[PDB]
């Protein structure tokens, strides 16, 4: 099936996946198109951040669904 990822600029890309594809695989495909390392990618769908080890069906990601890609602004303040 096909799914979509809305990226940092808003540009949506298209992914060819299977419902049993792992998040690691999905991230690899995202990297293939956008070049962001998988460890820096955060993928959000339905108020879940997608975690390596689980599958697209685990998160109820069905065909033509759109994932949302974000990075991290880390902060701790020291303290």
């Amino acid at each position: 099936m096909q799914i979509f990822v809305k990226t940092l600029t808003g540009k949506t890309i298209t992914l060819e996946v299977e419902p049993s594809d792992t998040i690691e695989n999905v991230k690899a495909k995202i990297q293939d198109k956008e070049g962001i390392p998988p460890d820096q990618q955060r993928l959000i769908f339905a108020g879940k951040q997608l975690e390596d080890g689980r599958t697209l069906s685990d998160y109820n990601i069905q065909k033509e669904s759109t994932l949302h890609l974000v990075l991290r602004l880390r902060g701790g303040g020291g303290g």
Partner: protein, 470 residues
Amino acid sequence: FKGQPGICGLTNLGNTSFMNSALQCLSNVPQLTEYFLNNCYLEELNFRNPLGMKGEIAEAYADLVKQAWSGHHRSIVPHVFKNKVGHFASQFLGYQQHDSQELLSFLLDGLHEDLNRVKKKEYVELCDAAGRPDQEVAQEAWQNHKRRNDSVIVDTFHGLFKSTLVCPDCGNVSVTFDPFCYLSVPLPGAKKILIVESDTALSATLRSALEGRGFTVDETTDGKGSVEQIRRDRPDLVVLAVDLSAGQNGYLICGKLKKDDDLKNVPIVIIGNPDGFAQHRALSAHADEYVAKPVDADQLVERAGALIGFPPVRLQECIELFTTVETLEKENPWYCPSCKQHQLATKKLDLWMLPEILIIHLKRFSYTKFSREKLDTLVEFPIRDLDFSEFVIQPQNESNPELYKYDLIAVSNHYGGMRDGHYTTFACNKDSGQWHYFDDNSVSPVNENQIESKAAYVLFYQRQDVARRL
């Protein structure tokens, strides 16, 4: 001491300002806090959910809420909450700096599973949208989500996106609905303009004129490197001179940019002798705008604003960009099943249903071959009366006014770089209406005109009907 309920700081446990900031945002979501202060959570604890943590997240968060709203504490040491959070999401073990929306995502999810009213999650394939009205399709998608996720978190924070694909060949339309909890909006730009001009006096004049309306301006006289500098610095607009030093030609450089599939969409303002404009429009790819030399500086500034829009970046423009009609690029064609072939279809996200509490996440980051950096541009957002009626009111939709208008209740602020920084929070107290600035232990009152700053990263908005329902 006798403090005011909800006016309570949080001690830093070692690079935990991101957690404290998220927590201060949530503490000031009224229906959540009341749900926890009235012990409503005790009856919905789900101990057998494999995706939860035996209720430990919900109980530790409840304890924090109860302590903060007791009025008994100036500040609180949320070490139990941190230990439970890390046990649920191991990345937060230790003393690392983290992203506050990521912590919120995990915290909200932990609360959701710990209080999920569903006993077991079922996968059900959604039926073809073809030929059915939008509301019916949207209902099936929400009910598929609710069949799996039914909690106070869903009831409070979750809305619904419509996504529409249109085939440019056969006109086939494909409709899908996705639930959401974070409205992660891209930034239109940083209001940065690059001037490619070998006349340095002229270039400085235009730089000052542009900076006089708030644009950030960079300059360069090196035409040869300009294409790649544009790819690196990603300016929002290029002022490009025709006659350049060392035999560079602005018209040719424009041609190179319009041929590059990454760079073809960057607005280009050509400044040059007017007698060269006809030929360039007749023979080449059009620059986005032509401005005649001796340059009228006001005219150039006027044109810049007309193309990219005057500073600063408005939240409304982020939402409008998010929901814009986009054309899939040649690397990302959609396979139209009706004409059974790959197409550069148009895709549009719509806000179909919006939640009682709306979390808006600004995508303050960029990633290119050359660097990853944080977008720190000022985004203006409204304190009151954020109106979504222009985005929600689409074919097959309607409402009453208070349903599409929101008022701000919290902001998570980030300072620093992508990997080293600090988090603080603005939050509005539900009992008094006073805003405060929470910086770990330090809590100080502020006025509404102090909330907005370039540090704002996560916005919490409350739907105007919510205050009334009690």
